[PDB]
Amino acid sequence: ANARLAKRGGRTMAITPRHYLDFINHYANLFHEKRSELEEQQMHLNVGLRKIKETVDQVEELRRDLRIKSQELEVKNAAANDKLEYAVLISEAQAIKADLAAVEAKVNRSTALLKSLSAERERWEKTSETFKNQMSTIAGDCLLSAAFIAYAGYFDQQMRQNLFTTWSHHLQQANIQFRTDIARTEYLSNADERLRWQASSLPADDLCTENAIMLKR
Amino acid sequence: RQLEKSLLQALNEVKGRILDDDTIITTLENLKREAAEVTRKVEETDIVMQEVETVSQQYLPLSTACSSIYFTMESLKQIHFLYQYSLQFFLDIYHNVLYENPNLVTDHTQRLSIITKDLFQVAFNRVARGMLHQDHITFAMLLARIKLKGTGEPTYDAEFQHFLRGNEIVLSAGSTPRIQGLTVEQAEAVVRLSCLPAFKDLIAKVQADEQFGIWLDSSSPEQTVPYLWTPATPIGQAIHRLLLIQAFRPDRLLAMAHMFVSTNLGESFMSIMEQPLDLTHIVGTEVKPNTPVLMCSVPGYDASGHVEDLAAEQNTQITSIAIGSAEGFNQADKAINTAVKSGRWVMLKNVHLAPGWLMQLEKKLHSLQPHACFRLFLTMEINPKVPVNLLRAGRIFVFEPPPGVKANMLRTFSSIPVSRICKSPNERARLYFLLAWFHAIIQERLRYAPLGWSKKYEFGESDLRSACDTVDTWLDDTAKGRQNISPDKIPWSALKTLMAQSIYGGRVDNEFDQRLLNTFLERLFTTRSFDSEFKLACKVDGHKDIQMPDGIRREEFVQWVELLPDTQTPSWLGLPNNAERVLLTTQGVDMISKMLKMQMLETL
């Protein structure tokens, strides 16, 4: 690529094995960082799913207890009607009714919690299922990220895109899977640090975005 | 993001049953409020969408033209390696456009077109002010291409590609059309042009239009072009005519390019470059005080006098220092510091000899903020030793011999002050006009070497100033305050001999060139003693000639200068009209090669 650019007419600049050493160091660092981030994210997801399963089990237990003591209240009311000692039975039925009201209120709050958290669960399950596939593409995607972050810092946008497309064609021909449907800036820069860069007088273009990524990494 | 992070870290640290804690109810309320703010997100997104679609449908073609203009200016440096414009220069162009509106409309639909036209015009002006005249047609063609691409208008991509890559593509071998009125190279050009479906039956059409043997080939094909490209837009008709004249008569390709640019952008689009350079307004307004004013100059034509006259007119002080020795660098730095402190102008002459010092100068200039009314002028020759940093920092002005007899007269009359030309007697103005005509002819003849002159003499402004001085002093000698002189009493022989032996004949080597100069002086400085109907030249051998204006005043002579037709032939100069043909064809081929360099960037 450097020879092609030199023959095209732009100034060539020398490539050294220091570039390769830096690129392989970047590959190791990015692979380790992405693996650690995925592992801690999965741990958080597993804890959240276990807790919401426990909440669903508690909801079912509350429902069973509520219906059982509702039937108990009905039986006690029938017994008090037959006995129509009446004041004690009336006070007992009132206490059972207050317990039913409290448990029904807690069931209502638990139902609201389940309805609010169902939308979260419906995407947490998808992310958990997608994690198994996205674990495999880490090697190729971090390879591309390291090559971009250690090599293409001098060329312009078109030549950087040519390099990225060539590497992607090679990895496709080598039967190694890489995460195609993601931006190379989005994979490397977090949203909060992108916001901090945009606050720190950085232009909002992709070129300056990966330039800031190179300056950070 | 705070929503998601806080919710996950709250659910992960419950350490118990969620249904048995009120903190989980607080997180529920948090989720409800944040769902409410996610709900009101939608109207803000809708207003953002309507705003961005409004601004897109208003000013997207303007931004596309912005990008195309700046990238053409960036890729411009591949031609002459001298000009390197910068994004700061382009943004200064935008501050000039969007904030200086002539006749300032209030209707946005007309204001957008006004902004676009003013952008194209001021971009061409500010860029071609620092380019040789060989490349102005190339830049105008690029501007016209950008206008055509940004125009609803059918894009002429295939025929423009054929026009740019006509000679490069291989034509038919062994195929020779009729030689009835065209040569072998013309036949090859027709064969190459025959690939276009529109230009299909050209072999039939050239013999169909047998009576049009003058409009197609020979004569002057600028105004007249036979045949056409279904209805066709005028721009497409211009493109077809340009292709036809490239096939038939490659000499007038420059004229066809000029009229194509005129039809595509305006008949006065590039006509402001023929005017003399108005340095005063550009220096006082269009130049930031930090930015130095580079005055590049071709050899034999300096530019110190222009800025010295400017400083004299504007009563400012210039500490002109010649560059080329160490103490020279010392007073240059001292005067620059004193100028930044005070505000007076500073000149450094011939800076093209110390690039190592120019690097320090450019870095020092970027390291300081100057006074408001302080401009730094640097003058240099065109050589590769000039640092690209300095070229990027400074505004670039080129100084070249003016293209055209009319342009030369305009520059001469702008240079000569009105108080000097309008002095008594009344024949001084006519004598100055004759002097300017003679200077224009002898300087226009330098272009067509070695026919006009055997050698490239340095017939510059020094000779003109000395001739004006000697005319003034001999007229003061022969006129004792009289308001008018009879033409017989004018020292014609004295003026002829003095300008033939001291001023203009001083640089003349060959006896044949000296005889030629004597011929011009004898023909021109007699006028049959200021007789009317004095034939200056013969523009066309068939019923055309240039005659002396009957005016007797500077305003009349200037008016006669601007009434000259924009067309010019070497028959004005006295050369045969075939003198400029090979040079014009070579310039056309150079234009084609320059645009080929432009488009490609868009054993032994």
PDB file of C-alpha atoms in Angstrom, chain A residues 15-192:
ATOM      1  CA  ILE A  15       7.455   1.312   7.674  1.00  0.00           C
ATOM      2  CA  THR A  16       9.464  -0.285  10.467  1.00  0.00           C
ATOM      3  CA  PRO A  17       9.157  -3.414  12.636  1.00  0.00           C
ATOM      4  CA  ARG A  18       8.448  -1.084  15.553  1.00  0.00           C
ATOM      5  CA  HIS A  19       5.041  -0.673  13.911  1.00  0.00           C
ATOM      6  CA  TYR A  20       4.506  -4.437  13.936  1.00  0.00           C
ATOM      7  CA  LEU A  21       5.609  -4.737  17.557  1.00  0.00           C
ATOM      8  CA  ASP A  22       3.282  -1.895  18.568  1.00  0.00           C
ATOM      9  CA  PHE A  23       0.438  -3.472  16.590  1.00  0.00           C
ATOM     10  CA  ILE A  24       0.854  -6.862  18.245  1.00  0.00           C
ATOM     11  CA  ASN A  25       0.996  -5.174  21.664  1.00  0.00           C
ATOM     12  CA  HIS A  26      -2.223  -3.324  20.809  1.00  0.00           C
ATOM     13  CA  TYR A  27      -3.812  -6.603  19.716  1.00  0.00           C
ATOM     14  CA  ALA A  28      -2.962  -8.255  23.032  1.00  0.00           C
ATOM     15  CA  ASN A  29      -4.195  -5.280  25.063  1.00  0.00           C
ATOM     16  CA  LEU A  30      -7.464  -4.912  23.138  1.00  0.00           C
ATOM     17  CA  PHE A  31      -8.210  -8.644  23.259  1.00  0.00           C
ATOM     18  CA  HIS A  32      -7.670  -8.694  27.027  1.00  0.00           C
ATOM     19  CA  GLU A  33      -9.724  -5.529  27.595  1.00  0.00           C
ATOM     20  CA  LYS A  34     -12.674  -6.641  25.463  1.00  0.00           C
ATOM     21  CA  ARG A  35     -12.698 -10.107  27.032  1.00  0.00           C
ATOM     22  CA  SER A  36     -12.652  -8.645  30.552  1.00  0.00           C
ATOM     23  CA  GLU A  37     -15.423  -6.165  29.728  1.00  0.00           C
ATOM     24  CA  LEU A  38     -17.585  -8.905  28.211  1.00  0.00           C
ATOM     25  CA  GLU A  39     -16.993 -11.156  31.225  1.00  0.00           C
ATOM     26  CA  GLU A  40     -17.987  -8.512  33.770  1.00  0.00           C
ATOM     27  CA  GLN A  41     -21.024  -7.532  31.680  1.00  0.00           C
ATOM     28  CA  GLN A  42     -22.126 -11.173  31.589  1.00  0.00           C
ATOM     29  CA  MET A  43     -21.607 -11.467  35.347  1.00  0.00           C
ATOM     30  CA  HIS A  44     -23.839  -8.431  35.913  1.00  0.00           C
ATOM     31  CA  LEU A  45     -26.437  -9.864  33.529  1.00  0.00           C
ATOM     32  CA  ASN A  46     -26.401 -13.226  35.325  1.00  0.00           C
ATOM     33  CA  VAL A  47     -26.850 -11.580  38.732  1.00  0.00           C
ATOM     34  CA  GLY A  48     -29.734  -9.487  37.399  1.00  0.00           C
ATOM     35  CA  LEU A  49     -31.455 -12.483  35.809  1.00  0.00           C
ATOM     36  CA  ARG A  50     -31.057 -14.564  38.978  1.00  0.00           C
ATOM     37  CA  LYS A  51     -32.545 -11.754  41.070  1.00  0.00           C
ATOM     38  CA  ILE A  52     -35.490 -11.259  38.709  1.00  0.00           C
ATOM     39  CA  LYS A  53     -36.133 -15.025  38.715  1.00  0.00           C
ATOM     40  CA  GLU A  54     -36.168 -14.896  42.520  1.00  0.00           C
ATOM     41  CA  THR A  55     -38.620 -11.984  42.293  1.00  0.00           C
ATOM     42  CA  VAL A  56     -40.905 -14.009  40.000  1.00  0.00           C
ATOM     43  CA  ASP A  57     -40.756 -16.938  42.440  1.00  0.00           C
ATOM     44  CA  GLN A  58     -41.671 -14.586  45.299  1.00  0.00           C
ATOM     45  CA  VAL A  59     -44.574 -13.289  43.182  1.00  0.00           C
ATOM     46  CA  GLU A  60     -45.854 -16.841  42.691  1.00  0.00           C
ATOM     47  CA  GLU A  61     -45.501 -17.585  46.414  1.00  0.00           C
ATOM     48  CA  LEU A  62     -47.401 -14.397  47.287  1.00  0.00           C
ATOM     49  CA  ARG A  63     -50.175 -15.371  44.863  1.00  0.00           C
ATOM     50  CA  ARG A  64     -50.466 -18.861  46.376  1.00  0.00           C
ATOM     51  CA  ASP A  65     -50.548 -17.513  49.934  1.00  0.00           C
ATOM     52  CA  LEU A  66     -53.086 -14.831  48.975  1.00  0.00           C
ATOM     53  CA  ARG A  67     -55.501 -17.300  47.391  1.00  0.00           C
ATOM     54  CA  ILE A  68     -55.083 -19.813  50.240  1.00  0.00           C
ATOM     55  CA  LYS A  69     -55.889 -17.282  52.944  1.00  0.00           C
ATOM     56  CA  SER A  70     -58.674 -15.792  50.805  1.00  0.00           C
ATOM     57  CA  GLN A  71     -60.293 -19.234  50.873  1.00  0.00           C
ATOM     58  CA  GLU A  72     -59.556 -19.334  54.614  1.00  0.00           C
ATOM     59  CA  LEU A  73     -61.347 -15.993  55.065  1.00  0.00           C
ATOM     60  CA  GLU A  74     -64.335 -17.315  53.106  1.00  0.00           C
ATOM     61  CA  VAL A  75     -64.493 -20.422  55.321  1.00  0.00           C
ATOM     62  CA  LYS A  76     -64.189 -18.300  58.479  1.00  0.00           C
ATOM     63  CA  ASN A  77     -66.964 -15.985  57.260  1.00  0.00           C
ATOM     64  CA  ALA A  78     -69.198 -19.001  56.616  1.00  0.00           C
ATOM     65  CA  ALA A  79     -68.412 -20.317  60.108  1.00  0.00           C
ATOM     66  CA  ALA A  80     -69.225 -16.937  61.676  1.00  0.00           C
ATOM     67  CA  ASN A  81     -72.500 -16.816  59.729  1.00  0.00           C
ATOM     68  CA  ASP A  82     -73.346 -20.291  61.039  1.00  0.00           C
ATOM     69  CA  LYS A  83     -72.446 -19.201  64.590  1.00  0.00           C
ATOM     70  CA  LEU A  84     -74.669 -16.111  64.192  1.00  0.00           C
ATOM     71  CA  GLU A  85     -68.010 -15.706  70.531  1.00  0.00           C
ATOM     72  CA  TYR A  86     -69.292 -13.645  67.609  1.00  0.00           C
ATOM     73  CA  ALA A  87     -67.218 -10.571  68.512  1.00  0.00           C
ATOM     74  CA  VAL A  88     -63.985 -12.592  68.679  1.00  0.00           C
ATOM     75  CA  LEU A  89     -64.733 -14.192  65.302  1.00  0.00           C
ATOM     76  CA  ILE A  90     -65.549 -10.764  63.836  1.00  0.00           C
ATOM     77  CA  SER A  91     -62.239  -9.354  65.101  1.00  0.00           C
ATOM     78  CA  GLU A  92     -60.383 -12.381  63.706  1.00  0.00           C
ATOM     79  CA  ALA A  93     -62.073 -11.956  60.315  1.00  0.00           C
ATOM     80  CA  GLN A  94     -61.211  -8.243  60.348  1.00  0.00           C
ATOM     81  CA  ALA A  95     -57.556  -9.044  61.076  1.00  0.00           C
ATOM     82  CA  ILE A  96     -57.525 -11.609  58.255  1.00  0.00           C
ATOM     83  CA  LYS A  97     -59.114  -9.017  55.947  1.00  0.00           C
ATOM     84  CA  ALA A  98     -56.445  -6.453  56.864  1.00  0.00           C
ATOM     85  CA  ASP A  99     -53.769  -9.069  56.152  1.00  0.00           C
ATOM     86  CA  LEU A 100     -55.444  -9.779  52.801  1.00  0.00           C
ATOM     87  CA  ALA A 101     -55.489  -6.065  51.961  1.00  0.00           C
ATOM     88  CA  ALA A 102     -51.791  -5.690  52.805  1.00  0.00           C
ATOM     89  CA  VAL A 103     -50.773  -8.804  50.856  1.00  0.00           C
ATOM     90  CA  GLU A 104     -52.921  -7.747  47.886  1.00  0.00           C
ATOM     91  CA  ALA A 105     -51.249  -4.323  47.912  1.00  0.00           C
ATOM     92  CA  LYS A 106     -47.822  -5.987  47.919  1.00  0.00           C
ATOM     93  CA  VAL A 107     -48.969  -8.230  45.051  1.00  0.00           C
ATOM     94  CA  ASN A 108     -50.048  -5.116  43.142  1.00  0.00           C
ATOM     95  CA  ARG A 109     -46.632  -3.504  43.636  1.00  0.00           C
ATOM     96  CA  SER A 110     -44.918  -6.752  42.611  1.00  0.00           C
ATOM     97  CA  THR A 111     -47.095  -6.905  39.484  1.00  0.00           C
ATOM     98  CA  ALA A 112     -46.134  -3.320  38.628  1.00  0.00           C
ATOM     99  CA  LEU A 113     -42.469  -4.250  39.147  1.00  0.00           C
ATOM    100  CA  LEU A 114     -42.797  -7.297  36.886  1.00  0.00           C
ATOM    101  CA  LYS A 115     -44.535  -5.260  34.182  1.00  0.00           C
ATOM    102  CA  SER A 116     -41.826  -2.593  34.339  1.00  0.00           C
ATOM    103  CA  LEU A 117     -39.008  -5.161  34.263  1.00  0.00           C
ATOM    104  CA  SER A 118     -40.459  -7.369  31.500  1.00  0.00           C
ATOM    105  CA  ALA A 119     -39.170  -4.974  28.829  1.00  0.00           C
ATOM    106  CA  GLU A 120     -35.700  -5.138  30.386  1.00  0.00           C
ATOM    107  CA  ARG A 121     -35.829  -8.947  30.504  1.00  0.00           C
ATOM    108  CA  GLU A 122     -36.964  -9.167  26.872  1.00  0.00           C
ATOM    109  CA  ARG A 123     -33.668  -7.584  25.770  1.00  0.00           C
ATOM    110  CA  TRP A 124     -31.426  -9.062  28.471  1.00  0.00           C
ATOM    111  CA  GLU A 125     -32.307 -12.543  27.216  1.00  0.00           C
ATOM    112  CA  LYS A 126     -31.411 -11.491  23.664  1.00  0.00           C
ATOM    113  CA  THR A 127     -28.067 -10.053  24.786  1.00  0.00           C
ATOM    114  CA  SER A 128     -27.333 -13.241  26.742  1.00  0.00           C
ATOM    115  CA  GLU A 129     -28.080 -15.352  23.661  1.00  0.00           C
ATOM    116  CA  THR A 130     -26.013 -13.024  21.442  1.00  0.00           C
ATOM    117  CA  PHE A 131     -23.023 -13.164  23.825  1.00  0.00           C
ATOM    118  CA  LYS A 132     -22.119 -16.692  22.712  1.00  0.00           C
ATOM    119  CA  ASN A 133     -21.814 -15.564  19.093  1.00  0.00           C
ATOM    120  CA  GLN A 134     -20.099 -12.269  19.917  1.00  0.00           C
ATOM    121  CA  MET A 135     -17.457 -14.041  22.010  1.00  0.00           C
ATOM    122  CA  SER A 136     -16.136 -15.811  18.904  1.00  0.00           C
ATOM    123  CA  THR A 137     -15.672 -12.678  16.764  1.00  0.00           C
ATOM    124  CA  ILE A 138     -13.478 -10.984  19.389  1.00  0.00           C
ATOM    125  CA  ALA A 139     -10.223 -12.276  17.882  1.00  0.00           C
ATOM    126  CA  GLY A 140     -10.850 -10.992  14.364  1.00  0.00           C
ATOM    127  CA  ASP A 141     -12.500  -7.746  15.435  1.00  0.00           C
ATOM    128  CA  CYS A 142      -9.702  -6.875  17.865  1.00  0.00           C
ATOM    129  CA  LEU A 143      -7.183  -7.763  15.148  1.00  0.00           C
ATOM    130  CA  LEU A 144      -8.807  -5.243  12.803  1.00  0.00           C
ATOM    131  CA  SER A 145      -9.038  -2.641  15.565  1.00  0.00           C
ATOM    132  CA  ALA A 146      -5.363  -3.037  16.484  1.00  0.00           C
ATOM    133  CA  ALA A 147      -4.233  -2.879  12.857  1.00  0.00           C
ATOM    134  CA  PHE A 148      -6.244   0.302  12.308  1.00  0.00           C
ATOM    135  CA  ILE A 149      -5.079   1.834  15.581  1.00  0.00           C
ATOM    136  CA  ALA A 150      -1.382   1.134  14.973  1.00  0.00           C
ATOM    137  CA  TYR A 151      -1.007   1.482  11.191  1.00  0.00           C
ATOM    138  CA  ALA A 152      -3.433   3.819   9.436  1.00  0.00           C
ATOM    139  CA  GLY A 153      -2.709   6.981  11.414  1.00  0.00           C
ATOM    140  CA  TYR A 154      -0.910   8.767   8.578  1.00  0.00           C
ATOM    141  CA  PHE A 155      -3.131   8.119   5.559  1.00  0.00           C
ATOM    142  CA  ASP A 156      -6.260  10.035   4.600  1.00  0.00           C
ATOM    143  CA  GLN A 157      -9.823   8.732   4.818  1.00  0.00           C
ATOM    144  CA  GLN A 158      -9.934   6.982   1.438  1.00  0.00           C
ATOM    145  CA  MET A 159      -6.646   5.160   1.979  1.00  0.00           C
ATOM    146  CA  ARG A 160      -7.643   4.166   5.517  1.00  0.00           C
ATOM    147  CA  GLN A 161     -10.873   2.740   4.112  1.00  0.00           C
ATOM    148  CA  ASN A 162      -8.875   0.864   1.469  1.00  0.00           C
ATOM    149  CA  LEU A 163      -6.659  -0.667   4.158  1.00  0.00           C
ATOM    150  CA  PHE A 164      -9.653  -1.638   6.297  1.00  0.00           C
ATOM    151  CA  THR A 165     -11.461  -3.160   3.315  1.00  0.00           C
ATOM    152  CA  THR A 166      -8.354  -5.138   2.331  1.00  0.00           C
ATOM    153  CA  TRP A 167      -7.962  -6.526   5.849  1.00  0.00           C
ATOM    154  CA  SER A 168     -11.674  -7.382   5.977  1.00  0.00           C
ATOM    155  CA  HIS A 169     -11.445  -9.196   2.630  1.00  0.00           C
ATOM    156  CA  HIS A 170      -8.453 -11.135   3.942  1.00  0.00           C
ATOM    157  CA  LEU A 171     -10.234 -12.189   7.122  1.00  0.00           C
ATOM    158  CA  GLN A 172     -13.282 -13.191   5.080  1.00  0.00           C
ATOM    159  CA  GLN A 173     -11.043 -15.293   2.821  1.00  0.00           C
ATOM    160  CA  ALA A 174      -9.313 -16.809   5.872  1.00  0.00           C
ATOM    161  CA  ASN A 175     -12.601 -18.080   7.396  1.00  0.00           C
ATOM    162  CA  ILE A 176     -12.195 -15.863  10.468  1.00  0.00           C
ATOM    163  CA  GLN A 177     -15.339 -14.074  11.615  1.00  0.00           C
ATOM    164  CA  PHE A 178     -15.274 -10.345  12.359  1.00  0.00           C
ATOM    165  CA  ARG A 179     -18.066  -8.095  13.620  1.00  0.00           C
ATOM    166  CA  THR A 180     -19.061  -6.379  10.375  1.00  0.00           C
ATOM    167  CA  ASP A 181     -22.140  -4.504  11.631  1.00  0.00           C
ATOM    168  CA  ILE A 182     -20.290  -2.112  13.928  1.00  0.00           C
ATOM    169  CA  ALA A 183     -18.334   1.097  13.433  1.00  0.00           C
ATOM    170  CA  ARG A 184     -14.610   1.045  14.125  1.00  0.00           C
ATOM    171  CA  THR A 185     -15.007   4.299  16.066  1.00  0.00           C
ATOM    172  CA  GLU A 186     -18.004   3.015  18.036  1.00  0.00           C
ATOM    173  CA  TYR A 187     -16.220  -0.181  19.044  1.00  0.00           C
ATOM    174  CA  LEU A 188     -13.225   1.720  20.433  1.00  0.00           C
ATOM    175  CA  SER A 189     -14.658   4.933  21.914  1.00  0.00           C
ATOM    176  CA  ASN A 190     -17.172   4.984  24.750  1.00  0.00           C
ATOM    177  CA  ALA A 191     -20.131   7.348  24.631  1.00  0.00           C
ATOM    178  CA  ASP A 192     -19.107   9.365  27.700  1.00  0.00           C
TER     179      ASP A 192
END
